[PDB]
Amino acid sequence: EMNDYAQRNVVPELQRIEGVGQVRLFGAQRAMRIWVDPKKLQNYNLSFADVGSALSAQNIQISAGSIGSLPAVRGQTVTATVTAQGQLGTAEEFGNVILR
Amino acid sequence: MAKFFIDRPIFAWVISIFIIAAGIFGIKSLPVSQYPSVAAPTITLHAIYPGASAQVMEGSVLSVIERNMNGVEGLDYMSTSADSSGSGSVSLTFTPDTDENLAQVEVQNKLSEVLSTLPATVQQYGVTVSKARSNFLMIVMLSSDVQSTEEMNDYAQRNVVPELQRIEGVGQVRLFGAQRAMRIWVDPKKLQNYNLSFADVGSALSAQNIQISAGSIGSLPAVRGQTVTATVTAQGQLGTAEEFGNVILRANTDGSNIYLKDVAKVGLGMEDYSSSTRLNGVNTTGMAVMLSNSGNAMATAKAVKERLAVLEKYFPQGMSWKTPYDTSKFVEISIEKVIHTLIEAMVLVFVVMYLFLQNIRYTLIPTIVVPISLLGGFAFISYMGMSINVLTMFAMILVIGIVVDDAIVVVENVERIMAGEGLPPKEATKKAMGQISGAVIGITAVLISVFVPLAMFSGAAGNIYKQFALTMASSIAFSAFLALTLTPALCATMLKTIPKGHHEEKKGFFGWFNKKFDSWTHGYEGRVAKVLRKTFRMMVVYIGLAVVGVFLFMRLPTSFLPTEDQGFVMVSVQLPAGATKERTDATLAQVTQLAKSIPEIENIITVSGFSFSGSGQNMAMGFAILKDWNERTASGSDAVAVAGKLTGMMMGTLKDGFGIAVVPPPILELGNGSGLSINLQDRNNTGHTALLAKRNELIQKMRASGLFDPSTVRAGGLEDSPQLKIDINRAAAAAQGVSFADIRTALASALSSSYVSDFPNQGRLQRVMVQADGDARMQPADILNLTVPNSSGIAVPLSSIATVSWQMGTEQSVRFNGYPAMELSGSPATGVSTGQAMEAVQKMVDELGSGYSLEWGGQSREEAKGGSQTIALYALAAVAVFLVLAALYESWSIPLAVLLVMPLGLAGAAAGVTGRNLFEGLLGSVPSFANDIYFQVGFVTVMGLSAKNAILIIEFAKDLQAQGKSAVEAALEAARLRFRPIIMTSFAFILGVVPLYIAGGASSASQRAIGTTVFWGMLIGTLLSVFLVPLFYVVVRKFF
Amino acid sequence: KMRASGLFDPSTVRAGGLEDSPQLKIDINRAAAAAQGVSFADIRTALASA
Amino acid sequence: GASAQVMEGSVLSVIERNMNGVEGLDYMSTSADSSGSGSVSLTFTPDTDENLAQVEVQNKLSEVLSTLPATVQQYGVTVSKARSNFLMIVMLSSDVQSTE
Amino acid sequence: GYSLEWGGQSREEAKGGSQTIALYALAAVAVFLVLAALYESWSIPLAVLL
C-alpha cells in the first residue's frame, strides 16, 4: 500500500525538481497477479494461452460513440453520449472470468 | 573629451557618419512584428480518438501521457483537457529562459515510447507535438456561394496552400476544415438481411484496397548471360468511388457476389463534419497565415495579397478571396505616428529656438543631433537581438524630449556665454563644456542607473519592460555621446560672433518679447527670494504635498495593460446540453441578423462547433469585425459600446441559449481580467460528485461568506449532460451464447466510425472511413445483438443484457499536475488586494478534509510571488543614483538635496490621473486608467527629467559658492540663470505631448495613458522644482 | 545548342539524371478475377513473394 | 511499391512544402527514384551552426508525420548531417579467402 | 517559365559578382573617413583616392 501510494503521489511530485534525474523506487506499484495451478489445467484440458485469450477478450474498453452524431438528418434535437464500462477493476470480478 | 572634440570637427563628423551607417544597417536587418516574445514555451499535443467520451479518452491516453512527462529540464506545470467530441489536449507549460525546440523534441522523444502502449486507434491518426506560442499575420477567407465547404477546402489545399507558404516570411499556414475522404455510408438493414457485418467489410476494404510491390526483373544475384533489367509496376489500389462500389465482400457458389454499391453508399465527403465557418451567411473556408521569427510583416502581407491577386486571376466562377482581419496594418500606423511626432517635434523645437535664441543658425544643431541618436538607438536594438513592434515605437516616442533636452541646454549655455561675455564661439563653447561636462556625465549616469533595473524583472512584465529599458537607456547614452562630441563642434564652427551692444538691442516684434521675458524672470526671481526666507513653512507644505501624493498613489487601482480597440469583438454562443447543430446554426443566423443591424460592424465570422471554453455540438463563436477608424470617430463607436449593444440585443432577441459579447483584451498570456483562478484538485481520487460538492461548497463560501463580487463568481468549466449508459450483465451472457468482443465491435461499428485504409485522390492520399447509416442511429433504442460463436445466432437483442437507462454524466475532464481539477474564478471586487484573498481561499481549502488541494494557474502564478522585486530594486536604484551624485558633487549632503524631487513626479502624475478619472467619470464612461505599465514608465521618464533639471540647478548653484557667495545668493543666481532653458524644454515637451494627450484611433488608450501621465508629471514637476530646488539646497547647506 | 559552340568542348556535356528505361506494366482485371474466382490477396502475395 | 511520381508527390512534397519557415535555409533539392527511396537535401546559410538547424528540422518534420502513409512511419525518416565528398578509401586485400 | 539555377561553386561565383564594386566602394569610403579623421582635412583624402 505504501509502495502504491509512493508511485502515485510521492514519485511524480519530487521528480519535477530542476536537478533530479532519476527516482528509483525500491519496490513495485500495484498490479493484478493471477497465480495459476498447472495441475488443474490438465483436468479441464486448458492452457495458459486460453487464460490469456479470455483475459484479453473480456477485459477491454468499450467505446460505443454517441446518439445523433454531427452528420445528422434535418430534425434531430437530442444528442446523448453512450458510455459503456465493460471493464474489470476488482478481484471478485476477475474471479468470474469465463474460460469455457 | 569635450576639450578634444571641439578643435577637431571632422573627427566627430566621421563618428556621426559611422553611427548613421550602423543605424541604417540595423534598420535594414530588424524583424517587424506587433508583439514580442512574451510567452513561455508551451507544448500542445492534440490527440485524436473518435467515438469516445471524456472519461474513456482520459483514462485511455491522458493518464498514460501525463505520467511520463516528468523529468524534462525546465517544466513548470502541466494540464490535460478532454471532452465528449473525441479530441484531447495536453498543455505542458515550461519555465522561462528555456529553449522551446529542445523541449518540443523532448516531448516528442517521450511520446515515441509512450506511443508503444497506446491503443491502435490513436496510432492511425497519430499524436503530434506542437507549440502553442505562434505568430499571427493574416486571415484569408474564400467565398463562392455555388460550391460546398469540402470543394473549396480541396481547392485551397491544392492551389492556395502550396503557393502561400513558399514566399519569404510566411512560417506556417494552418487550414480550418477537414480534408476530403471516401465515406462509405453502410446500411445495417442490408447487412442483417444478407447476413453480413462490419468486420468483413473492413477486412475487404483493407484487403482489396492495397499497394503491391512486385520488384524488378533481373536482380543483382543474376546468372551468366543476362543483359536486360526492367522493373515491374503493379497498381492495384482504388482511387475512384465507382471502383470502390465494386468491392467484393463475399463470393457465392453460383455467382452474383455482394458489392459495396447495393448494401452501402460510397461517396466523397469530409472527415468529421464537426466545424463550419461562415462569413455573412455564405460558405467560407479558413487559413491562418502565421509569421516566422526574424522576418518582416509589412512586405509579407503585400506579397500575400499579390499572390492572392495572381490566384484570383485564375479563380473559377464564384470564388473570391477576402481578408477581413490583418495585423500587418497595426504597425504602419505606429511608424507613421513616430514619423509624425518626430516632424512635429522638429517643428516645435525650430519655433522655440527661433523665438528664444533669435537666430536661425542655432536651430540647425538639434536637427542633426537627434536622428543620429535615433539611429544609434536602432543599432543598439539590432545588436541585442530585439525587433520592431508597438512597445519599441512607443519608447522611441517617449524618448523624444530627452534627446532634445541635452541639445537645448548645451546651446543655451553657449548662447548665454556669447551674449554675456561677447567671446568668440570657440572659447565660449570651451567654457560651457568645462562647466557642464561633468553635469551631463552625472545626468547620463543617473539615467542609466534608473533605466537598468527596469530590465531586471521576471515574467511577462519583465519582457515588456526590457524593450523600454534597452531602447531608452541606449538612446540616452547615444544622445549623451553626441552632445559630448559632435555638438561642441557644431557650436564652434557653425555659429557667428555676437556683436556687443547692437545684438540684444532689438527693434520689432522680439524686443517686446525680450522685455516681457526679462520682466517675467525678474518676477520669478522675486518670488524665489520671497520663498527662500520662510524655509520652515515651505518645508512642511512640501512634506504635506509629499504625503498626500503618496496617499493619492496608494489609492489607485492596479493593472498591467489597459484594454483597447482592435477592430473586432469576440462573441460566444452557448446552447444548453443536448442540442444539435441545427439549433446552433439557427441561433448563429439570428446572431448574424442582429449584427447586420449595427452600422459599426463591417463583417462577421461565424464558427459553429468550436469555442475557447470547450468544443461541442452546442458551442459556437463569432468575430464581429468593425470598420476603419476614420468613419468610427464618435462616442458610441468603440468596441466596448458595440459589445454592450450586442449584449443588449442578444438578451432581447436570442431566445434559444445565451450569448455574451465581450471585447478581446491585450496579449492572452497576460490575463488581465482573470481575477483569481482556483484549481481544486483531489489527492485520494474519490470521484466526480464529491469534487463537484466541494466546488459548490467553495462557491457558496466565496459567495455568502466572501467579498469576491458574488454576482460574477461561478464554475468556469462545463456542466453535466444526460447520457445513455448501459450495464452488460455477464451472468446472462455466460449462461447463453453471448460473448464479449461481439458487443464491442457492434457498438463501435454502429455508434462510431472506423478508419480502414487510404486511397490516392489525384496525387495525394486521403482516408477511407465507414460510418454505416446516419438515419438508423437517431433513437436511443439500439437492437443489434448478434454473433453467437458457432453460427449467425439471432436469439435476443440488447434489451435484457444491456439494460439501457439514462444517467447524468460529465462531458469534460480537466486534470492538473496528474490530479483532476475544477476551474474557478475570483474577483478583487472593492479595493481589496489579492494578497489577502489568496490567504482567504487557502484557509477555505485548508479547512476541508485531507485530500483536497489547490493550484493557482495562469496570471495568478506571478501574483503568488512576494513583493520583493519592485521595492528592493527601486531602493537599489535610488541608492545607486545617490552614490552617483555623491561621486559627482564630491559631498554627501547635496545628493540628499537632489533626491527630494523624486516624490514630486509621483504626486503630480497621481493627481493628474485622479483628475482625469474624476473628469471622465462625470462626463463619460467608467475610468479606465490605473497603475499599469504605461503610468509607471511615464513616472520613470518624468522622474529622470526632473532629476536632470535638479542636477543642472544644483551644479549651477555649487560652482557659484566658491567665488565668495552664500547659499541663498548662489541659489538665486542659479535660478536666474536656469529659468530660461527649463521653461524652454518644458514648453517643448508639453507642446510635443499635446497631440499625445488627445490622441484617438488605433491603440489610442496606451497613447492617452502615456500622454496624460508625462503631461501632468512634467507640469507639476517643473512648477514645483523651480520653486523648491533652491529651497532644498538652502535647507541642506545650513542643516548639515 | 550548348555543344559545338566553341565554349563547351564535346563528349563531356551530359545530363545529370537517370534516363528512362522500359518497365513492366501489370493491369489487373477485377471482372475476370470475380468471374473466375480468385481474390486480390493471392495475386498480391504472388507478386510480393515471387 | 511506388514509382517516381507518387513517392515524390505524397512523401517528399509535404516535407518540402512544410520545411519552409526555418531560418538560414537557402535552397531545397528533393530526389526520388523508381525503387521507392527519397532524399531531401536541405542547404542552409554559412556562418550558422548545425546544432539549432538539426533540431528545427526534426521539429518541422514531426508535424507532417501523421499525414504520411503508414509504411514510411515504420521505417522512419533517417537524419544524416554528413558530407558528400570522400576523405579516405581503405582497401582490404587477401588471397586466402573470398570478399564476403 | 523555363528558369535556370546553379549549384555548388557556380552559386558562389554568381553571388560574388556584385560584391566586388561594393567592396571597393566600402574600402574607398573607409580610407576616406579614416584619413579625414586623422589629418583633419577634407581635401587631404581626396588626393589619396586618385
Author numbering:
A (entry chain A): 151 to 250
B (entry chain B): 1 to 1040
C (entry chain C): 701 to 750
D (entry chain C): 51 to 150
E (entry chain C): 851 to 900
In the authors' words:
The reconstituted sample led to a cryo-EM map at a nominal resolution of 3.02 Å, allowing us to obtain a structural model of this pump. Interestingly, the cryo-EM structure of MtrDCR103 indicates that this multidrug efflux pump forms an asymmetric trimer of which the three protomers are distinct and display different conformational states. Like the structure of asymmetric AcrB, the conformations of the three MtrDCR103 protomers can be classified as the “access,” “binding,” and “extrusion” forms. Unexpectedly, an extra density was found within the distal drug-binding site of the binding protomer of MtrDCR103, indicating that our structure of MtrDCR103 is bound by a fortuitous ligand. The shape of this extra density is compatible with a hydrolyzed, decarboxylated ampicillin (Amp) antibiotic with its four-member β-lactam ring open. This is not surprising, as we supplemented with 100 μg/ml ampicillin in Luria-Bertani (LB) broth to grow E. coli BL21(DE3)ΔacrB/pET15bΩmtrDCR103 cells for overproducing the MtrDCR103 protein. Within 4.5 Å of this bound deactivated Amp, there are five hydrophobic residues, including F136, I139, F176, V607, and F610, which provide hydrophobic interaction at this distal site to stabilize substrate binding. In addition, N135, S275, and T277 are involved and perform an electrostatic interaction to anchor this inactive drug. Interestingly, a positively charged residue R174 is found within the vicinity of this Amp binding site. The cryo-EM structure of the MtrDCR103-Amp complex indicates that at least 17 phosphatidylethanolamine (PE) lipids are anchored within the transmembrane domain.
In N. gonorrhoeae, the best characterized and most clinically important multidrug efflux system that mediates multidrug resistance (MDR) is the multiple transferrable resistance (Mtr)CDE tripartite efflux pump. MtrD works in conjunction with the MtrC periplasmic membrane fusion protein and MtrE outer membrane channel to actively export antimicrobials out of bacterial cells. The cryo-EM structure of MtrDCR103 revealed that this multidrug efflux pump adopts the overall fold of hydrophobe-amphiphile efflux (HAE)-RND-type proteins and forms a homotrimer. Each protomer contains 12 transmembrane helices (TM1 to TM12) and a large periplasmic domain, which can be divided into six subdomains (PN1, PN2, PC1, PC2, DN, and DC).
